[model samples]
Target: IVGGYTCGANTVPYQVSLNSGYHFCGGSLINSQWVVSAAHCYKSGIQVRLGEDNINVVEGNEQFISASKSIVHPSYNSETYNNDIMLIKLKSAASLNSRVASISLPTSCASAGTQCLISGWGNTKSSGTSYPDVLKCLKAPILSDSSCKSASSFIITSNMFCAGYLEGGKDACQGDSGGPVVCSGKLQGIVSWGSGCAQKNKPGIYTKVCNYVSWIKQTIASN
Candidate 1:
């Protein structure tokens, strides 16, 4: 995210990188073998790198696993970026450790003004594409549905929510494409899209994970 601080090693253990040749997108480890990421980041030959903080350096704590299967939301529309969530199964189960762990899904939706955390590797500058080597994180607040709709011209569907300073300064502008937005220790949403990166009256949009709890569990169970 832009205007974020670098996280310490093992600080955000749930963070994962969806890689082909380099860190392309960030995701969260939801289980031993399942990773929740963005459907749009899906590509062949994806390697799920867990326990990762620095993308440019190799840490002994990192776990490199291949993507075995990826299930995108059936209702997803690539054009509007609606229902942009996806679950990826790891080729092998990640062993639990201090430097590697899974996060819990949200039990309820977040209300306006609720504080949340977001972490991943992305540009520190709002207008630059300089991907950080270390994972960075920021604290943002959840805005009401209308608050989000008022700023963006795109559809802020029920499946999505907004977070960040409405007046702009800090945001998950270009962080984990499918990374977690943890509210009260539960995964509330995932980085999806936004109108502008850290601009005034423009907040980062996210895929509301609370709206897909059933789909996630069912998909993991069936697949």
Candidate 2:
């Protein structure tokens, strides 16, 4: 959220806060009973707060629902931060409203150069030592695979993509992981990792959501 503006209430309806008494990560509501997030954000007692804008406020429209089951990608490699996607089955269906609705999964993979919108409640400082109480949005363009590989010291797998500026300043940070990066009106990425927040040549690396469309649908359908 560093270098982004405070998002208007309900402007990003699919955004949800991952909390265990405190907001720690962001996620997208894909359906009434399903959510998508970074596997690294998974924990036993997560509560998905949908329709949230100002997380610190009650925000009458928010729905606090617990996860019944969580399915992390079996091949997820924490050390490399690869295949870092996950699915959560909510205990109850999320009631859709003007401020709480599911987002469509990607119909196709996002190509390099497509500009996208990323929403989260992560740190607000261009180099923050703290967090924001309100949701924030940033517009970043996808970097080419070659550009992505050289942007950071991490291995950029086919399941990953990078978004940010070569000069730095605007990017997702700690607590932003698991949030949505919407492209072409579809969920294109899940904020996964980065070398550092808003650092030059270190764009935010995300889980390439299009690659998991089948996994997401299969996971939800069989259960």
Candidate 3:
């Protein structure tokens, strides 16, 4: 996340590194073999790394698994970025351990005013070209959907929500897309897009996980 700091090792075990050949996107482990990320981050050559905090080192606990298949939401809109979520099925199940676990999916809509944390290895700032070797996390407050819509020029749809500071400073930046937004220990949102990192009055936009819970379940079951 932008304006964030390095996270403690293994603090976010469910976090996954989506290796996109040239870069990486953040993802979350929802189950033993299912990973949830952003459709926009999809690329031809990709792999999923579990239980990893430092991308520069090969941790013994980390499991690098091939993505057998990926399914981007059929309704995903590139321009509007609606339904921006996607799922990746791993060739093998993640070996559960102290440093490897799954996060719980949301059962209800994310509540506004709630403090949440977003973690990823994305760029530290919008102007920066390099990403941190280790994962970073930032705490942001969830904003009302109506206010978010207004500030974002109505780009915030029913399937999308917003979080971060109005004064600018903390937010998810480039390479952070498809990361997890955790609220009270539950997975509430997925990093989708933003308006140039941490800009005044422009918070980070995320795909509302609760809105597509059924779709996620059905996609995995059917596949």
lDDT of each: 0.87, 0.90, 0.88
Stronger candidate by TM-score (2 vs 3)? 2
Question: Who wins the lDDT comparison?
Answer: 2
Q: Write the candidate numbers in order of decreasing lDDT.
A: 2, 3, 1
Ranking by TM-score: 2, 1, 3
Q: List the residue pairs that clash in candidate 2.
A: none
Better by TM-score, candidate 3 or 1: 1
Q: Against the true structure, what is each candidate's TM-score?
A: 0.97, 0.97, 0.96
Clashing pairs in 1: none
- Highest TM-score model number: 2
Residues 1-223 of candidate 1: C-alpha lDDT, one tens digit per residue: 8878888888988989899988888899999999998888778898999988777788788899999998888999999889999999999999989889999998788898999999888667777676778889999999988867777655778889889987887888665688889999999989999865788888898999999999999999998
Error of 3 at 90 (Å): 0.2
Model 3 over residues 129-160: C-alpha lDDT tens digits? 66788889999989998887777675667888
54-170 in candidate 2: lDDT tens per residue?
A: 899996998999999999998999888889998989999999998999899987998889999999998876654778788899999999988767656667799999998889899
Give the clash count for model 1: 0
- The reply for model 1, stretches above 4 Å from the true place, is none
Residue 222 lDDT, candidate 3, scale 0-100: 91
